[PDB]
Nucleic acid binder design. Structure first.
Ligand SMILES: [Mg+2]
Length: 746
DNA sequence: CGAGGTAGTAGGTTGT
DNA sequence: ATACAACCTACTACCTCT
C-alpha cells in the first residue's frame, strides 16, 4: 500500500540521565509579567557567566555547569536549592532544549574553505548556514555585488521520548540579508531617503521606513531621544557599550539618520541600520540576482532531503551526549506512531449533461445551473486605449457562444453556455479619463443610470501615478447590487494577435469567474459522504493593528449546489470571534437556509481558519436549543511542516490528495506540484469537537478544495475557508448587508 | 485587475 | 539584544497554464 512520512531523522544513541545545578525563582516585589521576568532572568544570568546554558521548566531554572556569578534583580531573587540529576522519563521538555544546545555546539566549530566559520549559531532553534547547497551539492556561497547574502536557515525540533530514544524533526528555508550598513551607503552616495530598514543592534522592529537624513552628526548632544543624551553616548551608557566602544573619529562625525516608524519618528545611527531585503527591493536593485536565486529558493522534496541530510551529517557525533548521532535517512513510515498514510481518491465532479473527465472540459458538459436569460453587460474603457476593449468584448462574447476563439470553433468549446446580454445600444460602453479618484467614483455612478445593466466589464490600465480604479469601481458597484469583472489592459493587448492558443486558459478563468459572479454554478459532486446538510466556514482578516474583520461562507447542500457568503456588520479587534458576531452570522445564515429549504438543518460542519478558540459552550448551547448536531473543524494553513512521499529509497513530492491521519489530527496536501522544482505546502486539520469521523471530514475538505468555481485550478484552501479568505482580502469591495447568491469576490 | 500556487519580508493575536 | 510557542494577517517576486 501507499505511504509517506515527515522530514525527520532517527536518533541512534539512547540518552543518558545527567546532573544539573538547579535554581529556584522566588519573586520579591511586583513583576509586570511573570514570563518576561523569568526569561530576562535567564538571559541576563547566563550572560554574566561566560554565556553558559540555562534551561527553564515552569518557574525552575536548570543548568549543567555552575553559575558562580549571580546578579541581583530587585524584582526577583534567585535561590540556590542544591544539585540534582533529572530523570529523562518526566523531563522530556528540558532534555529537548539540552539537545538543541548540543547541536549548536557540534555545529559551531565547523569551518569551510573560507577561513571563517560556516554556520551562524546563536544557540536557538534557528541555525543559519552561510552557504546554500546547490542542486548538484556544490556548496557555493551566493552573494550579489551589493550585499544580498542568501543563506539556508535550519529550524531544529528534536523530540525526546519517555524512554531514552530521540527523534530529530527538521525544517529549512531561505533567508536574505545584507552586510552593508546604511553608513556604507552614505559613503558610497546611494540615496537612502525611503528604503525600509532593519535595526541590527536592537532587533527592535521592522517597518522602519526612513523619513529624512539629518544634518547633525551623531556626536552632537541630545541627538538620542532620551533627554540630554547624545546618540553615541546612548549606547555607551547602556549595557551594550560594545556597539560603539571603539569608534572612528569619522564615525563620531558621521551624520545621524531619522526615520519615521509606524507614524512615529525616531533617531537612529547609520552604522546600526541595514536595509530590509525583500524580493521587491532585490528585483529593483539587482534584477539578475533574483532570477538566479529563483530556482534555489523553491525546493523540491528530494532537494530538501539532500540539504537536510548534509546538515545532519555535519552534526555528526555528539561526544557530550552518550555518543548520540542521527540516522542518514528518513523513516519510511510513521506507522510506529498512530499515523496512517494514505491517498485520497479524486472526487467526481458533475457537469450539466453528466460526469466530466476533466475540469477543462466542463464546458462540453455544461454548467450545472444557469440564470435567467440575457442578463446584459457593458464595458468601461479608459480614454486612451478603447480599441483593445472592443477586441476583448467580442472575444468574451464569442466564447459564451459557439465561436470561442478568433475563428468560430466548437471543436473545444460548447455553444450557448450561459445566458448573457449582447452589449446593444442600451447600456453602452463609453470612455473615461484617469487621474481623479472622485471622477472614477463618478463614472461608476453614471453606470447606475442605465437600466438593468447586469454584470459589468471594465478595462484597467497597467500600473504609478495612475491610481488604478479597481478599488473605487469595485466599491461603487458594491454599494449597488452590481457585479464587476475588471480586466487587465495587457491581457487585452494579448487578444488582438491570433498567434497563440494560450488565450483559452485566460478565457476559462474569466468565464468561470463571470459565471461565478452571477448565480450560475459550473459543477457539483456526484458522490459525497452525505451525512451533512450544510457546510459553513469562516475566517478573520485584519488590515490594520487592532482591527479584525470576520467573514463567513456557506454551502446549503453537501454537493455544493449553491454557494452563499455573509460579510459581518462590524469589526472585532481580536482574533477570537465575538459572541455577538457569532449570533449575527448564524442568525442570518440559518434564517436564509430556513427560507430556501423550509427549516433549519439536521446537522452541520464548520471550518475555522485559525484556532477555533471560540467559546465552545456557546456553540453547544445555541445548537442544543435549536436541536442541531454540529462538528467543529479547524483548517490551519500557515504551518512550517512539510511532507514527503517515500518509495523505496526515493523521496518525491506527495501527489494531490496525500493524507496522514492520527486520531482527530491530520495533514493533507491539497495541491498538485510537479516533482521538478517545488514542494507542496500541506495544511493541518484538527477536530476539537465533532461527531463525523475523521476520514469523512478529510474527504469532504479535499473535495471542497477541488470544487473551486473561480478557476479550473483547484484552490489549495477548501472553498469554505478559501472564500472567507477572499472576502477578508477585499472586505470593503464586498456587499456586507446579507447573504447573496451571486459571488462578488472571485 | 485570467487563475492558481510556491517562496521571501514584515507584523500581529492567543494560551501555556 | 532577548518571552515563548503556535497560528494568523499583509505585500511582492516568480512561474505555469487540455
Ligand atoms: Mg474576480
Amino acid at each position: 500500500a501507499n505511504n509517506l512520512t515527515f522530514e525527520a531523522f532517527e536518533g541512534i544513541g539512547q540518552l543518558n540521565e545527567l546532573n544539573f545545578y538547579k535554581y529556584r525563582l522566588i519573586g520579591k516585589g511586583q513583576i509586570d509579567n511573570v514570563h518576561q521576568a523569568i526569561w530576562s532572568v535567564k538571559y541576563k544570568l547566563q550572560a554574566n557567566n561566560f554565556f553558559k546554558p540555562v534551561f527553564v521548566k515552569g518557574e525552575i531554572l536548570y543548568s549543567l555547569d555552575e553559575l558562580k556569578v549571580i546578579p541581583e534583580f530587585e524584582n526577583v531573587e534567585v535561590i540556590l536549592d542544591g544539585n540534582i540529576i533529572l530523570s529523562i522519563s518526566e523531563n522530556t521538555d528540558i532534555y529537548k532544549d539540552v539537545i538543541v544546545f548540543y547541536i549548536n555546539n557540534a555545529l559551531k566549530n565547523i569551518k569551510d574553505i573560507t577561513n571563517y566559520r560556516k554556520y551562524i549559531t546563536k544557540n536557538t532553534d534557528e541555525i543559519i548556514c552561510k552557504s546554500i547547497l546547490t542542486t548538484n551539492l556544490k556548496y557555493q556561497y551566493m552573494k550579489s555585488e551589493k550585499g544580498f547574502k542568501l543563506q539556508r536557515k535550519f529550524k531544529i525540533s528534536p523530540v525526546v521520548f519517555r524512554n531514552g530514544k530521540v527523534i530529530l524533526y527538521l525544517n529549512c528555508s531561505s533567508d536574505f540579508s545584507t552586510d552593508k550598513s546604511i553608513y556604507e551607503m552614505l559613503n558610497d552616495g546611494l540615496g537612502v531617503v525611503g528604503l525600509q530598514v532593519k535595526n541590527k543592534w536592537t532587533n527592535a522592529n521592522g517597518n522602519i521606513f526612513i523619513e529624512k537624513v539629518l544634518d547633525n552628526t551623531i556626536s552632537d548632544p541630545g541627538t538620542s531621544g532620551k533627554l540630554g543624551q547624545s546618540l553615541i553616548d546612548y549606547y555607551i551608557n547602556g549595557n551594550q557599550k560594545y556597539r560603539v566602544e571603539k569608534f572612528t573619529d569619522e564615525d563620531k562625525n558621521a551624520k545621524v539618520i531619522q526615520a519615521k516608524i509606524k507614524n512615529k519618528t525616531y533617531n537612529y545611527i547609520p552604522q546600526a541600520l541595514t536595509p530590509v531585503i525583500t524580493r521587491e527591493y532585490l528585483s529593483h536593485t539587482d534584477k539578475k540576482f533574483s532570477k538566479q536565486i529563483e530556482n534555489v529558493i523553491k525546493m523540491d522534496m528530494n532537494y530538501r532531503y539532500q540539504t537536510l541530510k548534509s546538515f545532519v551529517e555535519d552534526i555528526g557525533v555528539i561526544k557530550e551526549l552518550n555518543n548520540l548521532h542521527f540516522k542518514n535517512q528518513y523513516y519510511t513510515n510513521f506507522d510506529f506512531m498512530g499515523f496512517e498514510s494514505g491517498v485520497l481518491e479524486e472526487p467526481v465532479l458533475m457537469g450539466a449533461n453528466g460526469k466530466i473527465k476533466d475540469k477543462k472540459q466542463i464546458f462540453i458538459n455544461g454548467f450545472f445551473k444557469n440564470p435567467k436569460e440575457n442578463v446584459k453587460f457593458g464595458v468601461l474603457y479608459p480614454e486612451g486605449c478603447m480599441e483593445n476593449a472592443q477586441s476583448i468584448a467580442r472575444s468574451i462574447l464569442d466564447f459564451a457562444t459557439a465561436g470561442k476563439y478568433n475563428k468560430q470553433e466548437n471543436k473545444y468549446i460548447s455553444k450557448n453556455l450561459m445566458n448573457i446580454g449582447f452589449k446593444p445600444s442600451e447600456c453602452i460602453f463609453e470612455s473615461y479619463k484617469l487621474g481623479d479618484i472622485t471622477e472614477y467614483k463618478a463614472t461608476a455612478r453614471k453606470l447606475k443610470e442605465h437600466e438593468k445593466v447586469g454584470f459589468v466589464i471594465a478595462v484597467i490600465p497597467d500600473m504609478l501615478e495612475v491610481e488604478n480604479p479597481y478599488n473605487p469601481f469595485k466599491k461603487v458597484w458594491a454599494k449597488l447590487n452590481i457585479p464587476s469583472q475588471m480586466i487587465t489592459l495587457k491581457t487585452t493587448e494579448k487578444f488582438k494577435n491570433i498567434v497563440d492558443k494560450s488565450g483559452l486558459y485566460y478565457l476559462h478563468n474569466i468565464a468561470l469567474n463571470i459565471l461565478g459572479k452571477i448565480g450560475g454554478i459550473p459543477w457539483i459532486i456526484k458522490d459525497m459522504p452525505g451525512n451533512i446538510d450544510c457546510f459553513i466556514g469562516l475566517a478573520v482578516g485584519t488590515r490594520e493593528k487592532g482591527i479584525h474583520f470576520p467573514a463567513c461562507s456557506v454551502l446549503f447542500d453537501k454537493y455544493g449546489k449553491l454557494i452563499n457568503y455573509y460579510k459581518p456588520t462590524i469589526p472585532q479587534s481580536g482574533e477570537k470571534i465575538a459572541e455577538t458576531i457569532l449570533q449575527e452570522i448564524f442568525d442570518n445564515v440559518l434564517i436564509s437556509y430556513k427560507e430556501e429549504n423550509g427549516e433549519y438543518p439536521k446537522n452541520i460542519v464548520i471550518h475555522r481558519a485559525g484556532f477555533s478558540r471560540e467559546n465552545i459552550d456557546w456553540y453547544k448551547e445555541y445548537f442544543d436549543k435549536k436541536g442541531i448536531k454540529f462538528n467543529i473543524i479547524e483548517v490551519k494553513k500557515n504551518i512550517p511542516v512539510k511532507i514527503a512521499k517515500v518509495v523505496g529509497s526515493n523521496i518525491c513530492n506527495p501527489i494531490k490528495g496525500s493524507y496522514v491521519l492520527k486520531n482527530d489530527k491530520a495533514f493533507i496536501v491539497t495541491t498538485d506540484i510537479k516533482d521538478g522544482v517545488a514542494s507542496p505546502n500541506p495544511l493541518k486539520i484538527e477536530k476539537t469537537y465533532g461527531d463525523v469521523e475523521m476520514k469523512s471530514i478529510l474527504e469532504q475538505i479535499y473535495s471542497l478544495s477541488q470544487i473551486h468555481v473561480g478557476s479550473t485550478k483547484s484552490l489549495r484552501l477548501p472553498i469554505t475557508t478559501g472564500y472567507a479568505d477572499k472576502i477578508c482580502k477585499a472586505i470593503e469591495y464586498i456587499p456586507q448587508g446579507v447573504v447573496d447568491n451571486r459571488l462578488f469576490f472571485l
